[PDB]
Write an enzyme that holds these catalytic residues in place. Structure first.
Site, PDB file in Angstrom:
ATOM      1  N   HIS B  61      39.653  29.666  44.235  1.00 48.68           N
ATOM      2  CA  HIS B  61      38.707  30.669  43.762  1.00 48.68           C
ATOM      3  C   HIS B  61      37.330  30.069  43.522  1.00 48.68           C
ATOM      4  O   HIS B  61      36.326  30.592  44.017  1.00 48.68           O
ATOM      5  CB  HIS B  61      39.232  31.330  42.488  1.00 48.68           C
ATOM      6  CG  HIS B  61      39.854  32.671  42.718  1.00 48.68           C
ATOM      7  ND1 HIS B  61      39.873  33.657  41.756  1.00 48.68           N
ATOM      8  CD2 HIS B  61      40.452  33.199  43.812  1.00 48.68           C
ATOM      9  CE1 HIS B  61      40.476  34.728  42.241  1.00 48.68           C
ATOM     10  NE2 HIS B  61      40.830  34.479  43.489  1.00 48.68           N
ATOM     11  N   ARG B  62      37.268  28.976  42.759  1.00 49.26           N
ATOM     12  CA  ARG B  62      36.017  28.329  42.378  1.00 49.26           C
ATOM     13  C   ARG B  62      35.184  29.249  41.494  1.00 49.26           C
ATOM     14  O   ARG B  62      35.076  29.016  40.286  1.00 49.26           O
ATOM     15  CB  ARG B  62      35.223  27.886  43.612  1.00 49.26           C
ATOM     16  CG  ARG B  62      34.373  26.649  43.387  1.00 49.26           C
ATOM     17  CD  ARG B  62      33.045  26.742  44.123  1.00 49.26           C
ATOM     18  NE  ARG B  62      32.271  27.921  43.749  1.00 49.26           N
ATOM     19  CZ  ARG B  62      31.516  28.009  42.662  1.00 49.26           C
ATOM     20  NH1 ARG B  62      31.413  27.004  41.808  1.00 49.26           N
ATOM     21  NH2 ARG B  62      30.845  29.133  42.428  1.00 49.26           N
ATOM     22  N   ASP B  63      34.598  30.297  42.071  1.00 52.20           N
ATOM     23  CA  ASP B  63      33.761  31.211  41.300  1.00 52.20           C
ATOM     24  C   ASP B  63      34.644  32.255  40.625  1.00 52.20           C
ATOM     25  O   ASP B  63      34.829  33.358  41.148  1.00 52.20           O
ATOM     26  CB  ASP B  63      32.705  31.867  42.187  1.00 52.20           C
ATOM     27  CG  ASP B  63      33.233  32.243  43.555  1.00 52.20           C
ATOM     28  OD1 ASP B  63      32.414  32.374  44.488  1.00 52.20           O
ATOM     29  OD2 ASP B  63      34.456  32.432  43.700  1.00 52.20           O
ATOM     30  N   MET B  64      35.181  31.911  39.457  1.00 52.99           N
ATOM     31  CA  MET B  64      35.942  32.853  38.649  1.00 52.99           C
ATOM     32  C   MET B  64      35.417  32.726  37.230  1.00 52.99           C
ATOM     33  O   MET B  64      35.224  31.611  36.739  1.00 52.99           O
ATOM     34  CB  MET B  64      37.454  32.574  38.750  1.00 52.99           C
ATOM     35  CG  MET B  64      38.397  33.110  37.647  1.00 52.99           C
ATOM     36  SD  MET B  64      38.176  32.696  35.901  1.00 52.99           S
ATOM     37  CE  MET B  64      38.290  30.911  35.959  1.00 52.99           C
ATOM     38  N   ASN B  68      34.642  38.115  36.934  1.00 57.47           N
ATOM     39  CA  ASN B  68      35.678  38.207  37.953  1.00 57.47           C
ATOM     40  C   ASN B  68      37.071  38.317  37.352  1.00 57.47           C
ATOM     41  O   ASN B  68      38.062  38.164  38.073  1.00 57.47           O
ATOM     42  CB  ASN B  68      35.613  37.009  38.903  1.00 57.47           C
ATOM     43  CG  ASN B  68      34.195  36.586  39.217  1.00 57.47           C
ATOM     44  OD1 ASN B  68      33.881  35.396  39.230  1.00 57.47           O
ATOM     45  ND2 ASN B  68      33.332  37.558  39.487  1.00 57.47           N
TER      46      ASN B  68
END
Ligand SMILES: Nc1ncnc2c1ncn2[C@@H]1O[C@H](COP(=O)(O)OP(=O)(O)OP(=O)(O)O)[C@@H](O)[C@H]1O
Ligand SMILES: Nc1ncnc2c1ncn2[C@@H]1O[C@H](COP(=O)(O)OP(=O)(O)OP(=O)(O)O)[C@@H](O)[C@H]1O
Lengths: 273, 193, 636, 638
Positions: B61-64, B68
């Site tokens: 995911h990284r961008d959580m 989100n």
């Protein structure tokens, strides 16, 4: 006999595989984008491997050409010996790149399937049926001829329905021969029940009359639903099995009213004759 | 007569095999819906198992973040990223772009730890500093770590160590999910205490 | 060390027990297996003929005959295939799990123009599921007639036939047990062959004694060919097929004489190969959404043999109106040939089928009247798909059609609306209502229609579900005129009006909040009305009054969490209306007036009715109405 | 004559290919097969112990162990079972369809006390689904251990097994394919065991090394850990329901459906005969929020055959309205498929479902004897009960008595139909019910005032499922349900009120006809009857057409055909209270002349207000709002 090629498939929008705490709508995206990016990396590896193959092939080609040129020309023996080692290094590079190629082939064999790689589109052709619609109701032309043709061809079936009493058997037997379901059938049933009471067969008239009354409500309900009676007749006997008391009395009273009308019409016909 | 026919019972079936339901969001720290130990522990546990699910599927995911992460009225958290709805929610490895792909499991665990810190403090990390020009500088250096003086009181102290060792920048000793399930398990055993 | 290499053995008696008893779950597939074997025999003999026509000098016709006989409790299945010699009669029908079909196919590998059904080698032995003993009479061109016979005892007897000879092929007699006497009826065998093997590539013929001879004679046999009347249409290339053949095929497929609206014919090639044919019904079934009908629309075929009917992994639920046939050349099949050994091949088939169906829908859009008919039939399915498929929601979005302000009674897509939308606005205005006239004139649309803006009408409860996921379109947010905080292109005079009105209209609004404190949680002034003084708008987070009504009136809806998502109402007073102005004039005299609040509550209730909400107790409204009409007529 | 008998043979290579390929749909059930065989060996040795306890000197415990070895990529399965000798090794594991378990069953010798799960003889070769090479090491009590080995190439080797010794039992080794490596991880084996072999009597102990060793006063993560969390649940249904206490049922319930609290009630019964099974059914305390989300792929009832999982719940296993029942159904002798994933004779499910339905209805009826628990059950499952009323046509009589409602004198507590019947006056011969939207909405309504003033008790029905229930319920103990919303309501009538009505018609027939003309299409009939006391006008529906509540419910259905509603309208019939002064005040106004704008205005207003008070919804509320607004204008003086 062997199913070893259909044991690794990766569908992205897998409805059955998910988590209760993971948004299924958004989970179907990171699976799809992962598939696409893996395919793109695979394609990049393919293309770079292929250019590497041709460039090392042309390397070894010019290397053998230069080896032959140095061998032909006298005085380049030391250069020929140096080019021996250079050539051997070039063969090592080439055979290593072929090793990379067969490892890539093995990776592709280990690559699980997907929708894009399992099959490629063949041919599709979309046809839109533009055909005249609507029907006509009249007592002449095709309709009267249809009456005559259907009564002549299928007298036995309509007669056997006339001699029927059971609902479930009627449902099944018509389901085998749903072609009998039409307005012309009801019209001829009514007319020939009129004829039967003209012959003064009261018990036979009632046996025929219950059956004739059966499809009248079927036709009425088909008109109500705006669907041909051939597609809604099967459920009618399910409704009459689960019919309320008032529906029972309504069926009975319509049967009695039609019986009285048939008797009166037959009496008028007898008096006229 | 032909009468009316009655009939009825045409399609009075119970065609209600469908569903509808959603609570709102998870961005409640701005909404200021402060909750107690039980709810935050449950949410952390459920988001942990959810994110471990994608970690197993090799999905990164990284961008959580809070934007989100989705809560639901069934007392469940749908960590399924909305897709659109940022800064301050990244890692220094992402900021420096040494390999142009910071996308790694340790980065996801770092993001998990910092969102845990945000929820257990009830405030956005680095609230004292609100200018992007200096915020980018700090994360580009990647030396300092957020303090843990704004902890929510009356809760098991184990998650304090969990968030403290989740936010250290050494990715090699960052905790992984197989022990994270044990961590949340002992958290929920420590809930009554 | 010591190594003792052996070879796997098989207990033949237990193997027979397994095959007979615990191998196939449906005892009526034996007929399908026998028809499949007969088709293989016919395919072999017909393939051998093109190399040398002299092969067929034992009977030119190729056919399968089914001859039930209740006078002997035997069902005979006769074909005119290649037959099989003594060596074949031993190997093929004596060695379990050995197929002569596979041996024949793997032998050529050059004449692969044929595709014969069978690769396992145990299909014949399913015949014992209904018969205790089977006798097989065959005559190959090379050998003589033999009478294979066994009772599944472990041994079979082969002898030269001493009875009536046949030209060529096979002759399977099934001495049925007393428990399977139902298989001797015309209806039963007709149903079996129609369900499982009605698309076999060779004529299938029944033979029964039901023909009445003129008058007491009924001994003539019925040469009823109608078991394979319909032939596989998707096999033939579409450029050679007109709409007439497709129509006849669809009519014969649905068992109902109605035409089809459109037909989609396509195929894919590769590792997975299937030639699929999809039809859009002219009308919708009366029980399309009746759950008792389950899913009986798309049938999966392998080499023109039925496998499984519509499964949820084969076609999504909202696309269950479209009915067709899917046939594939190669697939991994269960031993019973009724399910696939890989579940996700069905999902891949569904992935391709959905895309092709959506392309068919997009193609149908060009035809105006035809798409009008299709929409009036399956708009519910379209919107249900919008709700369900998040992956295909984008493709379903442009298939929508709605009544709008400027279209009269004709439906226009969202693309037409965004085409005609004024550049001053950046949002799509929609109203979720209950009836055409209920939303045509309503308190939430007065200002919008006054300023020339167009609003999309949504009169069906399905759109009420659809719009929760259709939260945007072409980068523009969809906002409702029944929700709080409606954004509108504002004018300097308009905002001056607003700012002076808030100060001017604060006393009466706080009075409303005081008198109505538990029923209304905000009273304010906005720009939504012209000819109406009061309206109830819902907050930006919650349920529209129509949305709340739909939730409340659902048959199976939990009530414990129903109270959580109650809409938080917001009274909206139109200051330009004389009623509120006169009410403020009366209030300025005194805030404790009886008539003032008994008129405020009446206004709130009437606006609640106008906003689509349901009254908690309509009896209060009724009784205050009659009391006020009493005072109107002066009868106390 | 010329008969020539042969013998049936087989193609071993093709038969192996069929066994590996075309039987088992899921590659994971190799674990189920191997665990079932290990349990079979354990059962054999345990039975032999009962006759001779001196053959257990090598190993005393009966355990099943799984030891994945990802570094070598092998998934062993050790067991201290009975083991196999040389002859057994070459016969049972070398012959297809030869199952030594069946032969051992034949040698029961009047000692039928164990259930032996093996009949086919093909179960072992399931290991080739995921393993390319199988190595089997077994050690019998009275034979030297031998190392069976094969790769499904049609030929297998047997070794003297000079390797590591084991006391007893077998030890199968699976050399997994280079791609089927996902079955070594703890998650997958845990899930497989929980799904299939969770109820095996013998303790299955998973082995894996991930322990973080203690370090105080480094970073060690290599230590095999023994886990038995995958067999903690123990089949209790196999015991008699007499020696099991409630807390045992609660523990099994929380271990089965993972719910926080315990069960509400339990049913534990069995039927003996040609069809034998022990059924254990629970009732959850709180129904899940997505219980009626029918896209959930029903899995409530898990059919177990001989303590192993067979199939999830199907439509024929349990009816839709009983989907809340959680539990297990375990049988002994049902015909299984070759894949052991379903039942061959699916028509026997039509008997299992009947038995389960009858016994669970008996459970519900018996549970309706203590007020608090039955109230808690009803609050959460009334929707399911009324759904059953609607659907089932054979238990309707039995199912009807378990229905609770608020009545006119029930206060804030629900009471049954039987209790109302007990409090039913002899002068009345019907059951009166009202179908509205809320308790307070129907508490005071134009249809109930007259009846409540007289001596009848009315039944409130507010939940939307009540109307679906009552369309099917047509009688109760010989008393027929009659709705107060429907026309032609019957009450016990004396002659004085009868002649009062006669004069009322003789006086008001002109009103009936004149506002029948006014409501030319909006109303079908206008009449006067005893249904109203303090309300002037109410509108009732037809005798068979949908009532107002049913109309609203259908028009609110998301997936409905908008062609069938049009002819299935509610034939609205306006009813007048002739005692209200309003309806006689305009009586003289219309008597003076038929055409008056004022009388039309009041008639329209009264019709709209009655429509709102009859539960109907206005076709266009804006007209009503506008006329109300103009009337307020005129009253206020503007
Ligand atoms: N009527 C027949 N005519 C010709 N050959 C036949 C006939 N019936 C059986 N056979 C032969 O018997 C062999 C094995 O029979 P069986 O039907 O069990 O196998 P199959 O046709 O390959 O089917 P399946 O794949 O369903 O097991 C076939 O390959 C075929 O050669
Ligand atoms: N691990 C084991 N321990 C002991 N005996 C075993 C083991 N595995 C196989 N066997 C023996 O193999 C024979 C049966 O093997 P297999 O598992 O193939 O058949 P089955 O269990 O009877 O069949 P199925 O499970 O398909 O109903 C029996 O003699 C059984 O004792």
């Amino acid at each position: 006999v062997d199913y070893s090629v259909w044991d690794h498939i990766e569908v992205s929008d897998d409805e059955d595989e998910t988590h209760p705490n993971i948004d299924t709508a958004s989970l179907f995206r990171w699976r799809h984008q992962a598939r696409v990016e893996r395919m793109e990396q695979f394609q990049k590896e393919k293309e770079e491997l292929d250019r590497g193959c041709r460039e090392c092939k042309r390397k070894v080609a010019e290397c053998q050409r230069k080896l032959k040129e140095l061998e032909v020309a006298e005085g380049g023996k030391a250069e020929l010996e140096r080019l021996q080692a250079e050539a051997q290094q070039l063969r090592k590079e080439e055979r290593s790149w072929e090793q990379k190629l067969e490892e890539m082939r093995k990776k592709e064999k280990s690559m699980p399937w997907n929708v894009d790689t399992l099959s490629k589109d063949g041919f599709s052709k979309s046809m839109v049926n533009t055909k005249p619609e609507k029907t006509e109701e009249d007592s002449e032309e095709v309709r009267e001829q249809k009456h005559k043709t259907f009564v002549e061809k299928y007298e036995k079936q309509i007669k056997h329905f006339g001699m029927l009493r059971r609902w479930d058997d009627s449902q099944k037997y018509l389901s085998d021969n749903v072609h009998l379901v039409c307005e012309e059938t009801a019209n001829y049933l009514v007319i020939w029940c009129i004829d039967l009471e003209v012959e003064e067969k009261c018990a036979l008239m009632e046996q025929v009359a219950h059956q004739t009354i059966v499809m009248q409500f079927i036709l009425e309900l088909a008109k109500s639903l705006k669907v041909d009676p051939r597609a809604c007749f099967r459920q009618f006997f399910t409704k009459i099995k689960t019919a309320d008391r008032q529906y029972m009395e309504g069926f009975n009273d319509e049967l009695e009213a039609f019986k009285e009308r048939v008797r009166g019409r037959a009496k008028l016909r007898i008096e006229k004759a | 007569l032909l009468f009316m026919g009655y009939m009825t019972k045409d399609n009075l079936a119970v065609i209600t095999q469908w569903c509808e339901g959603s609570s709102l969001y998870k961005h409640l720290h701005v909404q200021e819906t402060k909750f107690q130990m039980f709810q935050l522990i449950d949410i952390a546990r459920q988001t942990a198992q959810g994110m471990d699910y994608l970690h197993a599927k090799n999905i990164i995911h990284r961008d959580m973040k809070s934007n989100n992460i989705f809560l639901h009225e069934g007392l469940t958290v749908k960590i399924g990223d909305f897709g659109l709805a940022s800064v301050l929610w990244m890692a220094p490895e992402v900021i420096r772009m040494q390999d142009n792909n910071p996308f790694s499991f340790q980065s996801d665990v770092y993001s998990y730890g910092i969102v845990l810190y945000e929820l257990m403090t009830g405030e956005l990390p680095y609230s004292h500093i609100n200018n992007r020009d200096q915020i980018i500088f700090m994360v580009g250096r990647g030396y300092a770590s957020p303090d843990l003086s704004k902890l929510y009181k009356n809760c098991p102290k184990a998650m304090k160590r969990l968030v403290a060792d989740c936010v250290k920048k050494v990715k090699e000793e960052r905790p992984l999910f197989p022990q994270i399930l044990s961590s949340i398990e002992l958290l929920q055993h420590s809930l009554p205490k | 060390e010591e190594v003792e290499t052996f070879a796997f053995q098989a207990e033949i008696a237990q193997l027979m027990s397994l095959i007979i008893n615990t191998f196939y779950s449906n005892k009526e597939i034996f007929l399908r297996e026998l028809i499949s074997n007969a088709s293989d025999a016919l395919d072999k003999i017909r393939y051998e003929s093109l190399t040398d026509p002299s092969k067929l000098d034992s009977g030119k016709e190729l056919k399968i005959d089914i001859i039930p006989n209740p006078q002997e409790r035997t069902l005979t299945l006769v074909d005119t295939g290649i037959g099989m010699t003594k060596a074949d009669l031993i190997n093929n029908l004596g060695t379990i799990a050995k197929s002569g079909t596979k041996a024949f196919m793997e032998a050529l590998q050059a004449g692969a123009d044929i595709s014969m059904i069978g690769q396992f080698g145990v299909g014949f032995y399913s015949a014992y599921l209904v018969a205790e003993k089977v006798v097989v009479i065959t005559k190959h061109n090379d050998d003589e007639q033999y009478a294979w016979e066994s009772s599944a005892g472990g041994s079979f007897t082969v002898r030269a036939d001493h009875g009536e000879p046949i030209g060529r092929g096979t002759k399977v007699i099934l001495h049925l047990k007393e428990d399977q006497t139902e298989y001797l009826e015309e209806r039963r065998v007709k149903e079996v062959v129609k369900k499982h093997s009605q698309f076999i590539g060779y004529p299938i013929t029944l033979y029964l004694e039901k023909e009445r001879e003129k008058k007491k004679i009924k001994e003539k046999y019925i040469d009823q060919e109608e078991l394979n009347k319909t032939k596989p249409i998707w096999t033939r290339n579409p450029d050679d097929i007109t709409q007439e053949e497709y129509g006849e095929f669809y009519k014969s497929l649905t068992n109902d004489w109605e035409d089809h609206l459109a037909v989609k014919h396509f195929s894919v090639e590769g590792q997975l190969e299937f030639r699929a044919l999809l039809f859009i019904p002219r009308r919708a079934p009366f029980d399309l959404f009746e759950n008792k009908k389950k899913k009986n629309n798309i049938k999966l075929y392998v080499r023109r043999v039925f496998i499984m009917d519509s499964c949820d992994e084969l076609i999504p639920e909202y696309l269950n109106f479209i009915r067709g046939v899917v046939d594939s050349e190669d697939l991994p099949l269960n031993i019973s040939r009724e399910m696939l050994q890989q579940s996700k091949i069905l999902k891949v088939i569904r992935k391709n089928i959905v895309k092709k169906c959506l392309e068919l829908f997009s193609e149908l859009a060009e035809d105006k009247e035809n798409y009008k008919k299709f929409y009036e039939a399956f708009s519910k399915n379209l919107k249900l798909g919008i709700h369900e498929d998040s992956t295909n929601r984008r493709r379903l979005s442009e298939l929508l059609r709605y009544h709008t302000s400027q279209s009269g009674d004709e439906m226009t897509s969202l693309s037409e609306y965004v085409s005609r939308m004024k550049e001053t606005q950046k949002s799509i205005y929609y109203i979720t209502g209950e009836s055409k006239e209920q939303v045509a004139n309503s308190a939430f649309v007065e200002r919008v229609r006054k300023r020339g803006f167009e609003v999309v009408y949504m009169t069906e409860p399905i759109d009420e579900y659809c719009v929760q996921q259709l939260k945007e379109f072409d980068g523009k947010s969809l906002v409702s005129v029944t929700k709080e905080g409606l954004e509108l292109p504002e004018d300097e005079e308009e905002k001056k009006k607003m700012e002076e009105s808030k100060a001017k209209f604060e006393n009466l609004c706080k009075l409303m909040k005081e008198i109505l404190d538990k029923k209304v949680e905000k009273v304010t002034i906005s720009n939504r009305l012209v000819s109406s003084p009061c309206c109830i708008v819902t907050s930006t987070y919650g349920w529209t009054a129509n949305m709340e009504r739909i939730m409340k009136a659902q048959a199976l809806r939990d009530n414990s969490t129903m109270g959580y998502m109650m809409a938080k109402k917001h009274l909206e007073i139109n200051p330009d209306h004389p009623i509120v102005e006169t009410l403020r004039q009366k209030a300025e005299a005194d805030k404790n007036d009886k008539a003032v609040k008994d008129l405020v509550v009446l206004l709130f209730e009437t606006a609640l009715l106008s906003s689509g909400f349901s009254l908690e107790d309509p009896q209060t409204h009724s009784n205050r109405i009659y009391r006020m009409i009493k005072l109107g007529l002066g009868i106390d």
